[PDB]
Each structure stands twice: as C-alpha cells, then as structure tokens.
Amino acid sequence: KLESSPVDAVLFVGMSLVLGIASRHLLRGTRVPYTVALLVIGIALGSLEYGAKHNLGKIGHGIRIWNEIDPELLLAVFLPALLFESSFSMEVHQIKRCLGQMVLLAVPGVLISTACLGSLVKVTFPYEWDWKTSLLLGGLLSATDPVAVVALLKELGASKKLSTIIEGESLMNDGTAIVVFQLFLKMAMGQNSDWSSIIKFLLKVALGAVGIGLAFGIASVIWLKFIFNDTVIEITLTIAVSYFAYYTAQEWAGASGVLTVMTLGMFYAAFARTAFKGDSQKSLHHFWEMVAYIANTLIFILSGVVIAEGILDSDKIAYQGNSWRFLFLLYVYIQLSRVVVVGVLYPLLCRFGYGLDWKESIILVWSGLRGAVALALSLSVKQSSGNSHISKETGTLFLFFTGGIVFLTLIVNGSTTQFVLRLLRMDILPAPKKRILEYTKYEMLNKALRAFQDLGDDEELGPADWPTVESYISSLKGSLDPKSLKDIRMRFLNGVQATYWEMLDEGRISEVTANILMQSVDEALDQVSTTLCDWRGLKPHVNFPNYYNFLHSKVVPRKLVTYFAVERLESACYISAAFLRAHTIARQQLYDFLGESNIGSIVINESEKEGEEAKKFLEKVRSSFPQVLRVVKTKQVTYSVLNHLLGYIENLEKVGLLEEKEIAHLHDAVQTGLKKLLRNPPIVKLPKLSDMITSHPLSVALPPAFCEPLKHSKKEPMKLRGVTLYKEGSKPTGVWLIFDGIVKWKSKILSNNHSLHPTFSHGSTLGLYEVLTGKPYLCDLITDSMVLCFFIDSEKILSLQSDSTIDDFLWQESALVLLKLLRPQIFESVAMQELRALVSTESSKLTTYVTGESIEIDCNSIGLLLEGFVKPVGIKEELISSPAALSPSNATQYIVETRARAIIFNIHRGLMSWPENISLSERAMQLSIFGSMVN
C-alpha cells in the first residue's frame, strides 16, 4: 500500500493516452466526437474516486496527483500544445485573401460575444456574480477550439472558402479570447478598473506578445536556415522556441504566452517553408498534431475528473437545481450570442474577403465548437479558486459550466452542422468537379493495370491472381456537344489544370504555386458559363506596386536591391509564367482536339486576351529589374535539380548498395546545397553582350574569329515590346540573334495556316535563310517583350558561307526556323531544344540534289526545300519553289528541275478530353496477362 507516489502521474498520462486512442478508434464514423467520450470517462472516474471514495489503488493516486496541477503550469504546458499546430498548419497564401473577413470576426466578434454573454449571465445567473467575473466567464466561453472545427470540416463536404473562413475564425477567436480572459482575470483579482490601466495592460499583452513571438520566430528561422541536415534538431527547435517564448511572455514580460505561441506559429506558417526541409515538414506536422491530440485527451480527461471532484464534493453543486437549470440557459445564451455576432457582422462580412452567402452564414452559426482551450482556461480558474476574489464555488461553477458548454456544443452543433449542410445542398460535388474525380479514378485503375503488367511473368513464383488484386482496388471502379461554348471552356480549364499538374510533376513549379494555380482554376470552373475567370484568382498573388521603383535611387546599393526584388517578386513571377505557359499549352491542345471551329477560336481569343495582365506584369518585371527573372529561373531550375537528386538519394537509401557513410555524405551535400539556395537567392552575373553572343548557338559554334573586339563596345541590345526588327518582303540585310525575350512573326504570302503561338524563344537565329538564299524576308518580326538581340551584317554570313563545314550548319540553322514558319501545325508546339535533336541526327542530311534527279519522301518523313524548284511525280505540273514543304501522298516522289538543296526529317495529360480520347491475338495476350477479359 502506497500513497500518491509521483510515479503515478506516468500511470495517469499513459492510461489517458490509451483511453483517448480507444475513443478515437471506436468513435470514427459516429456523430459524437471522441473528446466527449473522454470527458464522460473523466467525469465517471472522478465521481467514483471522490464522491464515492472508492479504493482505485495506483489509478486513483495518479488522479489525485494530477488534481493539484498548478493553474499556471497547466496553461504553460498544455496551451502551447493545443494551439501551436493550428497556427503552424495554416496556409498564409489562403489567409491573405480573407484577413479582413476573419479580423472582423476576430476582434469585434470576440468583443461582441463576450459582452453579450457577460451581460446575460450577470443579469440572469443567481450567484451574486460581479460584472468582472461574469465578463470573465463570457470571455473564456467565446474561445473556439481549432481542433474540433477542423475535425468537423473534414468530416463532411464543405467548400474550401467556407472551411478556410471557419478555421481562421476559430484560431483568431482563441487568440482574442485568451487576451480577453487574461484581462478580466487580472481585473477580478486585485487590479483597479481604470481605463488607463486597462489600455496599458491590453497594449503590454497584445503588442508585447505579438512582438515577442515575432522576435522569437525571426531568430529561430535564421537558426533553421543554418541547420542543414538534421530533422531531429529542426523538430526540437520548434518545441524549445515555443515553450521558451511562452515563458518569456508569461514570466519575464507579463504579456500573453498563448498569444506569443500563436504568433510564433503564424510566423512559422508564413516565413518557414525555406527553413524547414521538405523531409522534415511532414514529420514536424505529424508530431505537432500528435502533441495537440495528447493535450486534448489529457485536458478532456483531467477537466472531467476535476468537474466530478468539484460537483461531487460535499453534495451540493451536482444536486442543486441552479446548475442543471442554468447550464441550458448558458447554452441558449451562447447560441444566441453567435447569432447576434453573425447578424451584426453580416452587412459587412459579405463585402470583404471571400464574401458570405446566406447558406454560408447559416453554417457560420452552429459552427462554434468549444474544446480544450475553454476547458483549460476554466480548469485554470478552478485550480486558482478558493481566494476572496474567486470563491471555491465560483471556480468550480466556472469549470462545470464550461465543461457542460463544451459537451453540449460538441454534441449539438456538430450534429446540426451535419444536418444543415446536407439540407442546404452545399455538400454535393458540382457537375464540373464530379468529372475530374472520375478522371483520377480511371487513371488510377490504368496505373494499377500497368503495375500488374510489369509484375506479370515471374516464372519462378508463378502468375498472380488478378481477381484478388482487383478485390483491393474495387473502390476505384463503379459527348461534350461542342456547340455549347460552356463545355468548351470547361474542357479548356481542364487542360490548364492538366498542364499545371504536369508542371508540378516535372518539378517546374513548387507545391504552393501549384496549389494557388489549381485553386484559381477551380474558381474558374464555377464561373464557366460567362467567361474564363481564372486570372481573377491570381491577381491577389500577382502585384507590382509602384513603391518598388524608388529602389533605383542611390539610397540603397544596386546589388542590395536585387535580394528584396527577388524575394518580393519570386512567387508572382512564377505564378505568371506558369499561367501563361499553361494557357499556351491549353490553347494548342484545344485546337488539336476540337480542330477548326468558331467556339474554339472564341475560347482561344478569350485566353489570349486574358493573359494580357500576366504579360504586362512580366514586362514590368523586365523593364524594372532585368536580372530578377533570370535569378528566379535559375533558382527554380536548381531547386528542381536538387529535389530530383534528393529523391534519387532516398531511393539509394532504400537500397543496401552504398556504405552508410557515403550515402550520408551525398545526402548532406545535397541538403546543404538545397538549404544554401532556398535560403538566399542565387547570385547570377549580367552579360556584357559578349556572354550572350558566346552562349548563342550560332556564334562560337560557327565563326572562328568574328567581330569579338566589337563585343565589349557595342550598342544596347534592349528592344521594347512591339519594336519591329525587319519587314516582310524587304531585301535581306542581316540576321537577328535572339538572346532573351519573345519575338512574334506574321506573314501574308506565308499564310498563318494553323499557328496560335507564332513566337521564337531565346537562342534562335532569324533572317539567316533570307541572307543565305537572297530571297526577301518571309515574315516580319515584332517583339512581344523586352528582347535582347544582336544584328550581324549579311556580308559576314556570306563570307562565312565559304566553308562547306560552315554551309551545312548554316542551312540547318535556317531550317530550324523554316520548320516553324513553313509548317507550324506540328513544329510550333515542340520546343526549339527538342527541334535541335531532329535536325542534328544523321538521318537528316543536307543533300544538294542534281537537276533531273528524283526526291522521294517517306510516309514518316517530311522534306523541306532550301533552294531551287521541284516538280511532283504523278500530279499535275504545278512547279514548286523555294521554301514550301513536302508531305507524303498517303507526293512520295518528286522531280528535281534545277539545282536544289533538300533535307528529309523523321516524323501531355488527356484531362482536356477524358471521355473521348480513350481480334484473337490480342484476346490471347489479355488472357496471358490477366487470366480473363478484364481491361
């Protein structure tokens, strides 16, 4: 026989964790949460251990040990646990769009709710309660648990906007209610209620906790930017910094430790994605979610134990009618308090942020769930009761009322939110959104089929049983009237979504950028029957305010401007580039699928005109800071490269191939490089018109000794958008090398057959064919952006034309742009770098045909004419001339009239068109690979 040995606290915490795990496991699909079961279990335990004084042995000893937990220690240990992950698991890029909508619900909402509840309880509750203590009860009861609301919101189908609003409101409500509760608790203890002291305390708490949290977050983020490869240190740093900032705010500064911890979580959500490594973030979120879960379980059991102790003390409170007949009244008042706040803020809530529909307002009511934050506050009040300011009855009554309110809310509000959402039809998947799920439910089945195919022969083990395999993926299994103008836009937006998906899979865009773009397109699908509203959801993230232009002054160094310019314009430039590239690809895909149609042209024109704002922002970036785009492109490319290397390194880790020391060294080096780059923007030099020439494909790879002495002293290559390089039909004068920018070509004799994006990227030589053959310019070039380009006189090209080893590459370089001009149907979608491989192969050879010979074009080959005339075989005598292209008849043969040079060449997700793009030997193949006809 022992008596409350301190080891019994370990018993209590372990038993509480076991009970919480059991409650969470058993109550998964049921309406009731596991927290109410935990509270009931704690109530029963405390009742049978205090009101009956049963000999619980060591189980009761731990209960009694935890019963005298310090009010300050309870909040110091359990409140940082409850609210760190909710602040940490926050999407700042999504909270930036409804900051105002939640702030109106944060400060004014909490103030109105606290005032209404305090006035109601002071008027009604027959406990002779002072105004200070009634306002304290109202303030602590205005706190809403983020854990409960996020658990409820994911339980049933709710819109992303509404879920974000509710989660942000709950977190901000806890943040403000903590301050309100602390203020009224200080007032209730010994402090005079003079407005000067109240204002000073509010300042020292709010703007003395926010500042402390910001300072701690800045210091810890700077530290994390130097902890290269250690997940354990990174996860431990969050614990240490949060639990040290809570102490420094509560004890050393007198501020609010809870608000400091929440501010630290906000800072981590905002400014710590470059600090925590990608591998560490998932484990960090899991750990903090588990810590919040443990705090919820421990608090919901301990509060039940202490409620059972207080109300089953000397048998008055539990048996008094003034408790059970006024808990319901307090529930009614806190429900009416929510209605009052919602109704008061509605005339202005719907005009801010995401807006607020009447259905969303009805959901805003009944979504107020009280959890372990209010429970912890009331338990701290109970443990600090018994003084003259707060009697033992007052603190016990506060804790009992808060527990009853928590139980009633989690029982009724959650079940009603189930009923109301299902009644307002806001939980049904929309028609254009219950079409991409079907796509990523038939694609998953295709991936499963391919995985079965790969593991198919295995003669040593034998054949697998396909029905058994499909028994585990059975959950995966269960036109577009082009004259619509509504379904066409939906298919185009599906193509944009697929392009964003491919860009993320390729690693071209980050996860947050991909999330922003995908949510923008998701907004677009809702407003699809009017126009293409997908850039409307991206302009919040794409802004170029005019106060960046003053950075060109001497007040700051030019090299110092780049870091700020890159940091501010990083996400916006990535978003704009992804937007424009996705719409280019989707325009090409839509034309390829729908063919030539009026509605397709309408949608293409809509997309082209919508991309204007993104093009304008990118042009503003080009004109203001030339090097920011290059820096961010290099950062993006190297981030993708290092992520690919890191993934390969984890694959190597999964294989017992290399020694652990060497794998550790490689992983440490790659993570160190990744942190060194994701920490600060890469430093990239600026070319002096000689580096661009050297990097250009034409130069260095052709001229042995060109005008190199003139490179260091040459005119500015900066050309504004819309500047015409040369006119169509004019006599050749020289070539225009493209270094950086976009130039667009238009022509009349060279008809724009099917080109939608007739532009030439960097590293392209223009005007070479005209200055080689002498034929006039086939098209005019207009710059679509700030283009860096060089002009070389045609006489230099003609002089270089002396050598055949120069001639063949010159003709290939000319063909590089001829393929894009003559046949833009299938040679415009492909990139220039991919087109380099087609011409650099040995199968494509520059052959100077002799007069009277025959040119034969294969079925999977396309020929181009560089000079001379060609006459078709088997067709009417229509003499073909310079440029022009040869295509298979299924003319497979030609006639070489005069001297001619000819070159013969060789020959994306389907989300845009999912339902349309999808013997006996094949049947036997299917039987050999599946055992039946299941494909």
Considering only residues 671-700, where is the footprint of a copy of itself by CB under 8 A? Answer: 673-674, 676-677, 682-684, 691, 694-698, 700
∠ CA 571-573-576, rounded to 5° = 105
Considering only 31, 200, 286, 609, the residue that binds a copy of itself (CB under 8 A) is 286
Nearer to a copy of itself, 52 or 837 (CB): 837
Minimum Å distance from CB 242 to ligand PC1?
9
Quick check: 30 binds a copy of itself (CB under 8 A)? no
Minimum Å distance from CB 77 to ligand PC1?
5
Partner in contact with 197, chosen from a copy of itself, ligand PC1, none, beta carbon below 5 to 8 Å by kind? none
* Contact between residue 395 and residue 384 where contact means Cβ atoms under 8 Å apart: yes
Considering only residues 61-120, where is the footprint of a copy of itself by CB under 8 A? Answer: 70, 72-73, 76-77
- Residue indicated by tokens 């602590």: 140
Minimum Å distance from CB 75 to a copy of itself?
9
**E strands present in 748-893:** 759-760, 765-766, 780-783, 787-793, 847-849, 863-867, 870-872, 885-886
Alpha carbon distance 664, 493 (integer Å):
44
Considering only residues 276-295, where is the footprint of ligand PC1 by CB under 6 A? Answer: 291, 294-295
Partner in contact with 823, chosen from ligand PC1, a copy of itself, none, beta carbon below 5 to 8 Å by kind? none
Q: How far is CA 588 from CA 190, 708, 760, 861, in A?
A: 74, 41, 16, 23
Considering only 11, 19, 65, 886, the residue that binds ligand PC1 (CB under 6 A) is 65
Quick check: 141 binds ligand PC1 (CB under 6 A)? no
* Contact between residue 114 and residue 50 where contact means Cβ atoms under 8 Å apart: no
Partner in contact with 4, chosen from ligand PC1, a copy of itself, none, beta carbon below 5 to 8 Å by kind? ligand PC1
- Residue indicated by tokens 């920011």: 628
∠ CA 794-796-797, rounded to 5° = 65
H-assigned helices in 595-625:
598-610, 612-624
Considering only 55, 196, 479, 805, the residue that binds a copy of itself (CB under 8 A) is 805
Give me 228's structure tokens: 């290269």
Q: Helix, strand, coil: what percent of the chain each, to 5? A: 60, 5, 35
State the virtual CA torsion across 297, 298, 301, 302 in degrees, nearest 10.
-160
In the three-class reduction of DSSP (H, G, I as helix; E, B as strand; rest coil), residue 374 is classed as: helix
Quick check: 243 binds ligand PC1 (CB under 6 A)? yes
Half-sphere exposure of 19 (CA within 13 A, CB side): 22
Minimum Å distance from CB 457 to a copy of itself?
4
Considering only residues 194-233, where is the footprint of a copy of itself by CB under 8 A? Answer: 223, 226-227, 230-233
Number of residues engaging a copy of itself in binding (CB under 8 A):
186
Alpha carbon distance 322, 343 (integer Å):
31
In the three-class reduction of DSSP (H, G, I as helix; E, B as strand; rest coil), residue 479 is classed as: coil
Q: Is 848 exposed, middle or buried (0-12, 13-18, 19+ CB in 10 A)?
A: middle
Q: Residue 367: which of 521, 588, 172, 146 has the closest Cα?
A: 146
* Contact between residue 176 and residue 106 where contact means Cβ atoms under 8 Å apart: yes
Minimum Å distance from CB 811 to a copy of itself?
10
Considering only residues 132-171, where is the footprint of a copy of itself by CB under 8 A? Answer: 154, 156-157, 160, 163
Nearer to ligand PC1, 10 or 657 (CB): 10
∠ CA 385-387-388, rounded to 5° = 130
- Interface mask toward ligand PC1 for 81-120; x: CB under 6 A: x---------------------------------------
Nearer to a copy of itself, 424 or 580 (CB): 580
Nearer to ligand PC1, 6 or 190 (CB): 6
Considering only 92, 327, 469, 533, the residue that binds a copy of itself (CB under 8 A) is 469
Determine the residue type at 89.
S
Considering only 32, 99, 658, 885, the residue that binds a copy of itself (CB under 8 A) is 658
H-assigned helices in 472-530:
487-506, 511-526
Minimum Å distance from CB 499 to ligand PC1?
44
Considering only residues 589-618, where is the footprint of ligand PC1 by CB under 6 A? Answer: none
Considering only residues 561-600, where is the footprint of a copy of itself by CB under 8 A? Answer: 573-574, 576-577, 580-581
Quick check: 751 binds a copy of itself (CB under 8 A)? no
Quick check: 160 binds ligand PC1 (CB under 6 A)? no
As beta bridge partners, residue 735 has 792
Rg (CA), the chain: 35
Quick check: 13 binds ligand PC1 (CB under 6 A)? yes
Q: Which stretch binds ligand PC1 (CB under 6 A): 6-14, 303-311, 782-790, 793-801?
A: 6-14
Q: Which stretch binds a copy of itself (CB under 8 A): 45-53, 537-545, 760-768, 820-828?
A: 760-768
Minimum Å distance from CB 293 to ligand PC1?
7
Considering only 387, 412, 457, 774, the residue that binds a copy of itself (CB under 8 A) is 457
Quick check: 753 binds a copy of itself (CB under 8 A)? no
End-to-end CA distance of the chain: 70
* Contact between residue 789 and residue 725 where contact means Cβ atoms under 8 Å apart: yes
| Sign of CA pseudo-dihedral 6, 11, 12, 13 | positive
Q: Which stretch binds ligand PC1 (CB under 6 A): 40-48, 72-80, 325-333, 630-638?
A: 72-80
- Residue indicated by tokens 């098209």: 779
Q: How far is CA 855 from CA 158, 223, 769, 870, 881, in A?
A: 66, 70, 21, 8, 14
Nearer to ligand PC1, 64 or 160 (CB): 64
Number of residues engaging ligand PC1 in binding (CB under 6 A):
22
Give me 99's structure tokens: 């900051």
* Contact between residue 338 and residue 113 where contact means Cβ atoms under 8 Å apart: yes
* Contact between residue 681 and residue 566 where contact means Cβ atoms under 8 Å apart: yes
Minimum Å distance from CB 891 to a copy of itself?
22
Partner in contact with 375, chosen from a copy of itself, ligand PC1, none, beta carbon below 5 to 8 Å by kind? none
* Contact between residue 533 and residue 527 where contact means Cβ atoms under 8 Å apart: yes
Q: Which stretch binds a copy of itself (CB under 8 A): 123-131, 138-146, 183-191, 280-288?
A: 280-288
As beta bridge partners, residue 865 has 902
* Contact between residue 245 and residue 193 where contact means Cβ atoms under 8 Å apart: no
Quick check: 354 binds ligand PC1 (CB under 6 A)? no
Partner in contact with 683, chosen from ligand PC1, a copy of itself, none, beta carbon below 5 to 8 Å by kind? a copy of itself
Q: Which stretch binds a copy of itself (CB under 8 A): 107-115, 358-366, 629-637, 715-723?
A: 629-637
Nearer to a copy of itself, 77 or 107 (CB): 77
Residue environment code for 900-912, b if the CB has 16+ CB neighbours within 10 A, otherwise e: bbbbbbeeebbbb
Quick check: 934 binds a copy of itself (CB under 8 A)? no
Partner in contact with 81, chosen from ligand PC1, a copy of itself, none, beta carbon below 5 to 8 Å by kind? ligand PC1
Question: How many residues does this entry show for the chain?
Answer: 935
Partner in contact with 589, chosen from a copy of itself, ligand PC1, none, beta carbon below 5 to 8 Å by kind? none
Nearer to ligand PC1, 247 or 442 (CB): 247
Q: Which residues bind ligand PC1 (CB under 6 A)?
A: 4, 6, 9-10, 13, 64-70, 73, 77-78, 81, 239, 243, 291, 294-295, 298
